[PDB]
Design an enzyme around this catalytic site. Structure first.
Site, PDB file in Angstrom:
ATOM      1  N   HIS A   1      16.994  -5.559  -7.249  1.00  0.00           N
ATOM      2  CA  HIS A   1      18.182  -6.101  -6.595  1.00  0.00           C
ATOM      3  C   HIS A   1      19.213  -6.413  -7.672  1.00  0.00           C
ATOM      4  O   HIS A   1      18.855  -6.717  -8.815  1.00  0.00           O
ATOM      5  CB  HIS A   1      17.888  -7.400  -5.827  1.00  0.00           C
ATOM      6  CG  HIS A   1      16.892  -7.259  -4.716  1.00  0.00           C
ATOM      7  ND1 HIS A   1      15.533  -7.359  -4.919  1.00  0.00           N
ATOM      8  CD2 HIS A   1      17.061  -7.052  -3.387  1.00  0.00           C
ATOM      9  CE1 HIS A   1      14.904  -7.195  -3.768  1.00  0.00           C
ATOM     10  NE2 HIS A   1      15.810  -7.002  -2.822  1.00  0.00           N
TER      11      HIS A   1
ATOM     12  N   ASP B   1      18.477  -9.684  -9.262  1.00  0.00           N
ATOM     13  CA  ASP B   1      17.300  -9.761 -10.135  1.00  0.00           C
ATOM     14  C   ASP B   1      17.691  -9.535 -11.589  1.00  0.00           C
ATOM     15  O   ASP B   1      17.140 -10.163 -12.497  1.00  0.00           O
ATOM     16  CB  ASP B   1      16.255  -8.704  -9.770  1.00  0.00           C
ATOM     17  CG  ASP B   1      15.722  -8.834  -8.361  1.00  0.00           C
ATOM     18  OD1 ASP B   1      15.717  -9.941  -7.789  1.00  0.00           O
ATOM     19  OD2 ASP B   1      15.279  -7.797  -7.837  1.00  0.00           O
TER      20      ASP B   1
ATOM     21  N   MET C   1      15.442   3.766  -7.638  1.00  0.00           N
ATOM     22  CA  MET C   1      15.954   3.077  -6.461  1.00  0.00           C
ATOM     23  C   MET C   1      16.590   1.748  -6.875  1.00  0.00           C
ATOM     24  O   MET C   1      16.160   1.108  -7.837  1.00  0.00           O
ATOM     25  CB  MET C   1      14.847   2.818  -5.429  1.00  0.00           C
ATOM     26  CG  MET C   1      15.379   2.150  -4.147  1.00  0.00           C
ATOM     27  SD  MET C   1      15.332   0.329  -4.177  1.00  0.00           S
ATOM     28  CE  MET C   1      13.595   0.006  -3.847  1.00  0.00           C
TER      29      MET C   1
ATOM     30  N   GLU D   1      15.564  -0.153   5.554  1.00  0.00           N
ATOM     31  CA  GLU D   1      14.219  -0.717   5.548  1.00  0.00           C
ATOM     32  C   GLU D   1      14.062  -1.671   6.723  1.00  0.00           C
ATOM     33  O   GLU D   1      14.677  -2.752   6.718  1.00  0.00           O
ATOM     34  CB  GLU D   1      13.975  -1.448   4.226  1.00  0.00           C
ATOM     35  CG  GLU D   1      12.647  -2.151   4.122  1.00  0.00           C
ATOM     36  CD  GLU D   1      12.491  -2.797   2.768  1.00  0.00           C
ATOM     37  OE1 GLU D   1      11.980  -3.932   2.699  1.00  0.00           O
ATOM     38  OE2 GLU D   1      12.917  -2.173   1.776  1.00  0.00           O
TER      39      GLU D   1
ATOM     40  N   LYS E   1      12.267  -4.407   9.412  1.00  0.00           N
ATOM     41  CA  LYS E   1      11.305  -5.502   9.478  1.00  0.00           C
ATOM     42  C   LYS E   1      11.491  -6.210  10.813  1.00  0.00           C
ATOM     43  O   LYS E   1      12.636  -6.471  11.192  1.00  0.00           O
ATOM     44  CB  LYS E   1      11.500  -6.489   8.324  1.00  0.00           C
ATOM     45  CG  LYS E   1      10.363  -7.518   8.244  1.00  0.00           C
ATOM     46  CD  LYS E   1      10.553  -8.551   7.148  1.00  0.00           C
ATOM     47  CE  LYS E   1       9.245  -9.300   6.891  1.00  0.00           C
ATOM     48  NZ  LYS E   1       9.378 -10.415   5.909  1.00  0.00           N
TER      49      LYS E   1
ATOM     50  N   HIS F   1       5.290  -4.359   7.186  1.00  0.00           N
ATOM     51  CA  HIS F   1       6.313  -4.704   8.169  1.00  0.00           C
ATOM     52  C   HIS F   1       5.977  -4.146   9.550  1.00  0.00           C
ATOM     53  O   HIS F   1       6.094  -4.849  10.559  1.00  0.00           O
ATOM     54  CB  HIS F   1       7.678  -4.205   7.696  1.00  0.00           C
ATOM     55  CG  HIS F   1       8.247  -4.989   6.556  1.00  0.00           C
ATOM     56  ND1 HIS F   1       9.496  -4.737   6.028  1.00  0.00           N
ATOM     57  CD2 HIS F   1       7.749  -6.040   5.862  1.00  0.00           C
ATOM     58  CE1 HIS F   1       9.738  -5.595   5.050  1.00  0.00           C
ATOM     59  NE2 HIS F   1       8.695  -6.400   4.931  1.00  0.00           N
TER      60      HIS F   1
ATOM     61  N   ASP G   1       7.526   1.945   0.868  1.00  0.00           N
ATOM     62  CA  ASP G   1       7.092   0.693   0.246  1.00  0.00           C
ATOM     63  C   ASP G   1       5.633   0.427   0.614  1.00  0.00           C
ATOM     64  O   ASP G   1       5.317   0.254   1.795  1.00  0.00           O
ATOM     65  CB  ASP G   1       7.943  -0.489   0.713  1.00  0.00           C
ATOM     66  CG  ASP G   1       9.243  -0.645  -0.062  1.00  0.00           C
ATOM     67  OD1 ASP G   1       9.558   0.205  -0.917  1.00  0.00           O
ATOM     68  OD2 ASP G   1       9.929  -1.665   0.168  1.00  0.00           O
TER      69      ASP G   1
ATOM     70  N   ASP H   1       4.655 -12.366   6.526  1.00  0.00           N
ATOM     71  CA  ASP H   1       4.680 -11.199   5.632  1.00  0.00           C
ATOM     72  C   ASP H   1       3.880 -11.500   4.363  1.00  0.00           C
ATOM     73  O   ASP H   1       4.361 -12.193   3.466  1.00  0.00           O
ATOM     74  CB  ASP H   1       6.132 -10.859   5.306  1.00  0.00           C
ATOM     75  CG  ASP H   1       6.295  -9.549   4.535  1.00  0.00           C
ATOM     76  OD1 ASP H   1       5.410  -8.667   4.578  1.00  0.00           O
ATOM     77  OD2 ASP H   1       7.345  -9.416   3.867  1.00  0.00           O
TER      78      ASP H   1
ATOM     79  N   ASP I   1       2.540  -9.407   1.870  1.00  0.00           N
ATOM     80  CA  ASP I   1       2.832  -8.655   0.644  1.00  0.00           C
ATOM     81  C   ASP I   1       1.643  -8.635  -0.335  1.00  0.00           C
ATOM     82  O   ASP I   1       1.772  -8.946  -1.522  1.00  0.00           O
ATOM     83  CB  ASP I   1       4.078  -9.223  -0.040  1.00  0.00           C
ATOM     84  CG  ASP I   1       5.364  -8.841   0.673  1.00  0.00           C
ATOM     85  OD1 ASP I   1       5.350  -7.905   1.496  1.00  0.00           O
ATOM     86  OD2 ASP I   1       6.400  -9.480   0.402  1.00  0.00           O
TER      87      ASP I   1
ATOM     88  N   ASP J   1       5.959  -2.872  -3.144  1.00  0.00           N
ATOM     89  CA  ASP J   1       6.673  -4.114  -2.870  1.00  0.00           C
ATOM     90  C   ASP J   1       5.602  -5.139  -2.482  1.00  0.00           C
ATOM     91  O   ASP J   1       5.226  -5.240  -1.314  1.00  0.00           O
ATOM     92  CB  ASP J   1       7.714  -3.898  -1.759  1.00  0.00           C
ATOM     93  CG  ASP J   1       8.499  -5.159  -1.438  1.00  0.00           C
ATOM     94  OD1 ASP J   1       8.328  -6.162  -2.152  1.00  0.00           O
ATOM     95  OD2 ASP J   1       9.259  -5.161  -0.447  1.00  0.00           O
TER      96      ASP J   1
HETATM   97 MG   LIG Z   1       9.867  -3.874   1.248  1.00  0.00          MG
HETATM   98 MG   LIG Z   2       7.102  -7.435   3.073  1.00  0.00          MG
END
Ligand SMILES: [Mg+2]
Ligand SMILES: [Mg+2]
Ligand SMILES: [Mg+2]
Ligand SMILES: [Mg+2]
Ligand SMILES: [Mg+2]
Ligand SMILES: [Mg+2]
Ligand SMILES: [Mg+2]
Ligand SMILES: [Mg+2]
Lengths: 385, 385, 385, 385
Positions: free
Chosen positions: D52, D55, D86, D179, D181, D218, D243, D253, D255, D285
Site C-alpha cells: 500500500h 506502508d 502489484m 478484490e 470481501k 474472503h 491472494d 477474517d 488471514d 495476504d
Molecule cells: Mg487480500
Molecule cells: Mg483477509
C-alpha cells in the site's frame, strides 16, 4: 418511552467510551473522561455503569494515581445517584495476555492474571458491585497443537476455585458470572456458548457462587437461538447478569445498539425476561459505530433503552390479549405445562391408551396452529393491533 | 490400511441403507435388507451395527412379524460375528412426532413416545447393546410462541428421569447418551450443542446414567471446534459414544464419509481420541451420496474406516517424533499441565514475583512458537515427514 | 390490510401444496388438487399462480392425460380471474437428474433436460406467462473431482443459448430469469449468488433475454445483504422477477412465510422495491410448516400478503416524514447522488482543494449521524411514530 | 520442497510487517523496516513484494521524505533481485475514510480518494508493477438508510471509469483488479463476492482493463466454494491476480498462513491453478498470529510457500495416475467436456432418442462413482499412494 433509573439500565464505560479503532482503522473519536460519561448517562436516565479495572485506572498507575482516579469517580457517582452493579478484569488487552490469562501456557502469566483479578475484586466490593464478570477472550487457540484443552480446563477450574476461596474467606457479598463467546479474538475460545459455561460451572468446588453473563451477539455468532439459551439459563437458576446488543448473523462481533440486528429475537427475549421476572440489571455492551461523532454516541445509547421499552410494551400487550390467550390454548401450550406422567412409571406402563389402543393417525392429523399464533405476535410487534 | 473387528468400527443400518430421498428428490437406490447389510459390512471388516427400532421392525408390525424380523437379524449376527453395541428410537419420522416426542405440546403424544422408547430398550438389552442413544430431532420450534422452553425442559427431564427409573428397576446394564444437534429438521432444536446437553445432564435425578453422543457434523453446523468440544466431554467423564462423519461448514447436515469435510479437524480428533484412550465404538453416521449406486455405497463405507486408520498412523507419528516433542516444550505445553498455585491462595497472595516484582514486558516479549509447531503437524499429516 | 389482485401477489402451486416431507419425516398433509388451490388463493386476494411442469402434469402422463390436466386448470383460471405470470421446469426431482440437468456429466441426460424444458416453454406461452424461471438445483457437486467447473459453465451457456435460439425462432414474447442458490440439495451449487448469475448472463449470446429471479432466503444462506443484492440487480436493469420468503440465518433452506426471519431486511427490501417502482409480480416461494393442517396453510399464505402490505405502509410513512427527509440531508444522502467529478479528469487533477489544500482532519471530524437516522427507521417500522 | 524465485511467490509488506493489533489488543511486535522485510523475504526464496502507498511512505510525508523512502526501497530491491508486481492504495485506515473512499457520502472525500489513488498509480508504474489492486474495505454500511446502493454503484463506476481514463491517457502498461470481501470492517461491503465484482466490471466503460483479485478467506467468509469461484473467474478470462491464505469457516477474517484452514479446498485450488496454467504471482495476504515473535513470523511465511509446493506435487501426482485417469472416465468427466448439441437446435428437436424414446430409468440407475474418485484424491493428498 422515557427511561427512569427504575428500569435498571446500565452501560459499560468502554461502550460509549469506544474510540473507534477496528482491525483496519485508527480512532475516530477522542477519549472520554469517565466523569463525563457518568454525567451524560445519568441525564439520559441510566441506572448505573460498569468497568474493567483498566478502564478506570490506566495500566501501570502508581498507588497514589490509583487513589485519585477512584476518588474522582466516586464523587461523580455521588453527584448523580449512579450505581455500579458489576465490574470485571481486563485480561485481554496487554501483550502479556496474548496466549490467555487463566489458561496461558506460561505458569507465571497465569499467576499474574489471578493477582490482577483479585486486586479488582476488592475494588468492586468497595464500590458496591454485586456481580463480578469474567470474559476469557484470550483463552483458546488458533491451531490444534498449541493448547491441550483438558489441561486448559484444569487450569481454568483451578483459577475459578481459587477466586471462590478468596471471596468466601474475606466474607464478600459478591457472585461470579462467566461470559461465553465462540471466537474472536482467538480462532476458537474456550467455553464457547452458554451451554458450555453452564456445564463447566457444575464441576467447580462451590457451584452456587457462579452463574453466566450471556451476550445477545455472542450466541448469534454461533447461529444459536438466544432466547432459547436464556431459558436454559433461567431453568438452571443461573442467569446472574445479561449483556444486551444487536448482531446481524454469523460474522465478526458487531456490538450494535440493542434492537438492531435480529429484531424478532429481541422481542422474544424481552418477552421472556419480563415473563420470568428477571430482576438483574439490563446491561448494554455495545459500540457506537465509528462513523459517529459524540452526538451520535449519545443518540445510539438513548436508542438502546428506547427499543427495550417499546418491545416491553408490545410483549405485554401480546400476553394480555384475550385472542392470543385463546390461540395459546389452541396450540396446547397449556398441555405442555402439565406433567407427562405424574401417575408414575407403573401406571404409564399399564396404560393401554398410551400405546396398544393409542390412535396415532388421529393425533397426527391435529394441526398445531403455530402459524396463526405467530402472526398474532407479528401484528402485536408491528402495532397493527 | 486394512480394518479388523479389533478397530471397533460400527455403522448404522440407516447409513448404508439410505435410499437417497432429500427435500427435493425421490429415492435413487432400492431398500436394503438388514441381513445383506450385516453381511456386506462384516466382509469390509466392521465390528458391528446399530439400529433404530423402525429400521429393523417396520412401523405397525404385529407381534409375530416382529418375532421373525428379530430372528432373521440374530441369525445374520450369529453367522458373521457382528456385534450390536448401540441402539436408539425413531421419534422423528412418523407424522405423530411433527411437534416432538418427549416435548410435544400434546400430552398423549409424549406418553406414546415414552412407551415406544421403553419397548425398544428391552430389545436393545436382549441384543447386547451397552449404550442407548436419544436424538431429539423434532424437539424445538420454528417460531417463538410455539414452545415455552422452560416447560419443555421440565418435560424433557421428566422423560429422561422416567427412563432412568425403568432401567434401574429392571436391573439393566445399559447407559444413555444424548446426541445434540443445533437445527434441522426443526428451525431450532433443544440442547443444540455438546455443552447444552452436558449442562442439562447435571439436573437429572441420576446423572451417572447419562452421557453424550456427539456428531462431527452437528457441532460444525454451529461453527464450533469439534475436538475442543470432545475434550470438554472427556474432561467431564461423559464421552459414552461418538458419531463420525464429514461436513463442509455451516449449512444443511451433509453426513459425508469420515475424513471428508474438514480434514485437519479430523486429524486433531483422531489424535485426541487415541491419546486419551477412548475405548468405545468408532461409529459412522453418514450417507453415501445419492449420485452413487451400490458399488459406490460400499466404496464410501470402506473410505470411512480407511481414513480413520491413516489419520491414526499420522497422529501417532506426530506424537512420537522427537522434534515435535521438543517443539511442544518450546511452546510450554509442559507448563500448561502444571498447577498454577499448588502452593495455595495465601502463598500466591504473598508472592511478590507474581505481581509487584513481575516483569510484564519480558514475559510479553516471549514467542509462543505455535506456527513452527503447527507446520510440523501439517508435515506429518501430509506425509512430508 | 386487505390484499387485492391490484397488489399482484402470486404463489407457486408447490408452496401451499407442500405435503410436508423433509429429510427425516413423512408427509403430514394430503395432496392438493391444483383446482382447489387456485380457488382458495383467489378468495384470499391473490393475483395469480405459477407452476413447475410436473406440478400440473404428473410425470409420465400420456398426451391425452396431459390434455385434460391443462383443460381443468384453464377452467379454474377462467372461473376466478387468476393469472399465470411465470412458469418453470422440474429438473431436480426425478432420479435421472441426480447429477444435474443442463450440466450432468452424461450427455444424454443433458439433451433430455433441454427437450423437457422446451416442451414446457410452449405450454407457459400458451397459458400467458411472461417470465420463465430456471433453478438449477442439481447443478454442482459434493466433491472436487466430480465436476470440472469450466466445462460445466460451457455446458450451462450452451443450454441457455439454445433456449434463447428457440424462443426467438418461434417469435415468443417470453424472457428468462435465473434463480441462484448457494447450496442444498448439492453440496455446492453453480452460480451460487445473484452476483455470479449476473456475471454469467453477460457471456450469453443474447444477454437481453435473461435476468435474475432472486430469493430472500437463498442469499441469506450465504450471509449476504438481500436488499443490497437486489439494488445491484436493479442497477444492472436485470430484476425480472423476485421470490419472497423468510429465513433465519445460515442453515438449511427454511422457506418461511414472508416477514418471518429477518424482519428489518424485509422492511428495507419493501422500501427499495416500492421506491424504484418494480412492477413485476410479488411472488411467494414458501412452505407452510408441516406442523400445520390446511387451516394453518391458508393462514400462513394470508400472512405473506399481510406482512408485505404493513411493511409497505411503514416504509412509505418513513420516506414521507419531513423529519426523516432532513436527517437524510444531515447524513449527506443528497451528496451521494451527485457526481464526484462531472468537471472531468483534468479539472480534478488541477483542483488543489481535492488534495494539496484538502483539510483531512476537518472532514474526518464530521459525524455521519447514521444512528439517529436508523432509529427513526426503527420508530417508523414499530409504529412509535 | 525449497522455493525459488521461479515459483513467483510474493508477499505484502503489511503481512510479515503486521504488528499484531486486533480489536481487543495492543501490538505484540515492533515495526519492520521495509528494507529488512525485502532482505529477509529474498533469503526465504520469495520472488517479490507488494505495498500500500502508506506502508512505504508514512501518511503526511513531505515530498523530500517521500523521495528517500522510495530510494532506500529501490536500493534494497536492486540488492536482492526482488520484484514489485502489484501495488494498491490505503483507502481504509485514516479516519477520513470512515464512510468510504470512492463511495463516501461526502463528495469532497470521494475526490480526495481519487487523487490519493492516482498519485500511487504513478509510483507503481515507476517501480514496475503490472497490476493495481483496489480493495474497497470501507465501502458499505451498518444500517439500511445510510447508503442508497444504486447511487453508490454510480459513484463506484464513476471512480473506476476515471482511473481507466487516466492510465490510457498516460499510456501506462497497467491493469486493475478488484478484490471483493463480504463484510468487515463494515457490516456489509459492496461487491461482496467474486460474482458481484465480475458482474460490476461488465458495466465499466473499458471492461478489458479490469479483472478480479480474489482472496481464499474472503469467499469462505460467505461459506462459498473458493475453487468454484476461481473457475468462473478463469472461464470469464478475468483472473488477473490471486491472494492466498487460510480461513476456518464463517467468522472474522483470520488471514492464516496458506494451507491452514480448509486444507482440501487448498488442494483443489492448487490443482485448478496449475491445470489451467495461471501465470500470475502466487501472492500471500496473511498475518502471522500475534502469539509469535519474529522467528515465528519468518517460520509462518516459509510455511505458506512450503504448503503450496507440497500440494502442487500431490495434485500433479493425482492427475498423472493412470488409475485416476480411468476413474475420471468412469465418472464421465470426458462426456462433460463434449458439446450437448453441436448438431444444433432443429436436430435436437427431431431426435426422438432425446425424449420420446429416451429410457429414463436406465439412465437414472447408472452410478456416477464419485466416491471412489474422491477417495483416490484423498489417498493422493495424504501420500498413501
Ligand atoms: Mg487480500
Ligand atoms: Mg483477509
Ligand atoms: Mg460482543
Ligand atoms: Mg459482553
Ligand atoms: Mg448428521
Ligand atoms: Mg448422528
Ligand atoms: Mg428456498
Ligand atoms: Mg425460489
Amino acid at each position: 418511552y422515557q427511561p427512569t433509573p427504575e428500569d435498571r439500565f446500565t452501560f459499560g464505560l468502554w461502550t460509549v467510551g469506544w474510540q473507534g479503532r477496528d482491525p483496519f482503522g485508527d480512532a475516530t473519536r477522542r477519549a472520554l473522561d469517565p466523569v463525563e460519561s457518568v454525567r451524560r448517562l445519568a441525564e439520559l436516565g441510566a441506572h448505573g455503569v460498569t468497568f474493567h479495572d483498566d478502564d478506570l485506572i490506566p495500566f501501570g498507575s502508581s498507588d497514589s494515581e490509583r487513589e485519585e482516579h477512584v476518588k474522582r469517580f466516586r464523587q461523580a457517582l455521588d453527584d448523580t445517584g449512579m450505581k455500579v452493579p458489576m465490574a470485571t478484569t481486563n485480561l485481554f488487552t496487554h501483550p502479556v495476555f496474548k496466549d490467555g490469562g487463566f489458561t496461558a501456557n506460561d505458569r507465571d502469566v497465569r499467576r499474574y492474571a489471578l493477582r490482577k483479578t483479585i486486586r479488582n475484586i476488592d475494588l468492586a466490593v468497595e464500590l458496591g458491585a454485586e456481580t463480578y464478570v469474567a470474559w476469557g477472550g484470550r483463552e483458546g487457540a488458533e491451531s490444534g497443537g498449541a493448547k491441550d484443552v483438558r489441561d486448559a480446563l484444569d487450569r481454568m477450574k483451578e483459577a475459578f476455585d481459587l477466586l471462590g476461596e478468596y471471596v468466601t474467606s474475606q466474607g464478600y457479598d459478591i457472585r461470579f458470572a462467566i461470559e461465553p463467546k465462540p471466537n474472536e479474538p482467538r480462532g476458537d475460545i474456550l467455553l464457547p456458548t452458554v451451554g458450555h459455561a453452564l456445564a463447566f460451572i457444575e464441576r467447580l468446588e462451590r457451584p452456587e457462587l457462579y452463574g453466566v453473563n450471556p451476550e445477545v451477539g455472542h450466541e448469534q455468532m454461533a447461529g444459536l437461538n438466544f432466547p432459547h439459551g436464556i431459558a436454559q439459563a433461567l431453568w438452571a437458576g443461573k442467569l446472574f447478569h445479561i449483556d444486551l446488543n444487536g448482531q446481524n448473523g454469523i460474522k465478526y462481533d458487531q456490538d450494535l445498539r440493542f434492537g438492531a440486528g435480529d429484531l424478532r429475537a429481541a422481542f422474544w427475549l424481552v418477552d421472556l425476561l419480563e415473563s420470568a421476572g428477571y430482576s438483574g440489571p439490563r446491561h448494554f455492551d455495545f459500540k457506537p459505530p465509528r462513523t459517529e461523532d459524540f452526538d451520535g454516541v449519545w443518540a445510539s445509547a438513548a436508542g438502546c433503552m428506547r427499543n427495550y421499552l417499546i418491545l416491553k410494551e408490545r410483549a405485554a400487550a401480546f400476553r394480555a390479549d384475550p385472542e392470543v390467550q385463546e390461540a395459546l390454548r389452541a396450540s396446547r401450550l397449556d398441555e405442555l405445562a402439565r406433567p407427562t406422567a405424574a401417575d408414575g412409571l407403573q401406571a404409564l406402563l399399564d396404560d393401554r391408551s398410551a400405546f396398544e389402543e393409542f390412535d396415532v393417525d388421529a393425533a397426527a392429523a391435529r394441526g398445531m396452529a403455530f402459524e396463526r399464533l405467530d402472526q398474532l405476535a407479528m401484528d402485536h410487534l408491528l402495532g397493527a393491533r
